[PDB]
Amino acid sequence: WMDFDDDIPF
Amino acid sequence: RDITPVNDETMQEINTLLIALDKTWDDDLLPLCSQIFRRDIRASSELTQAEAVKALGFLKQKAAEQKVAA
C-alpha cells in the first residue's frame, strides 16, 4: 500500500 | 490503536511545513491522508496524533530534500 514512508509526490 | 486526537503542538509543526512547501490541507494533505489511511478525513483536526506524526515525518522529508521552486 501507499504509506507516508514512501517516496510519494506532493 | 491509540485514537487520541492530534494535539495543537503537532498541528502547528505541520502547518509550518505546509506553508514552507506552499501546500495546503484542502488541496494536498487532507486528500493524501484520506488515501493513505483509507478513511474520509474532512478536516485537519480529525487526524489522530499517531496519524499526524506519520504525516509530519513525510513533510519533514519533503522540506529537507530540496529547495521549494518558485
From Swiss-Prot, chain A:
It comes from the Bacteria. A motif (Important for interaction with partner proteins) lies at residues 5-10. May contribute to the conjugative processing of DNA. It has a functional relationship with Psi (plasmid-mediated sos inhibition) proteins. Homotetramer. This is Plasmid-derived single-stranded DNA-binding protein. It comes from Escherichia coli. The chain holds residues 166 to 175 of 175 of the full protein.
From Swiss-Prot, chain B:
One of its GO terms (molecular function) is DNA binding. The keyword Plastid does not apply. One of its GO terms (biological process) is DNA recombination. Keywords: DNA recombination, DNA-binding. Gene bet protein functions in general recombination and in the late, rolling-circle mode of lambda DNA replication. Has a function similar to that of E.coli recT. It is a single-stranded DNA binding protein that can promote renaturation of DNA. This is Recombination protein bet. It comes from Escherichia phage lambda. The chain holds residues 192 to 261 of 261 of the full protein.
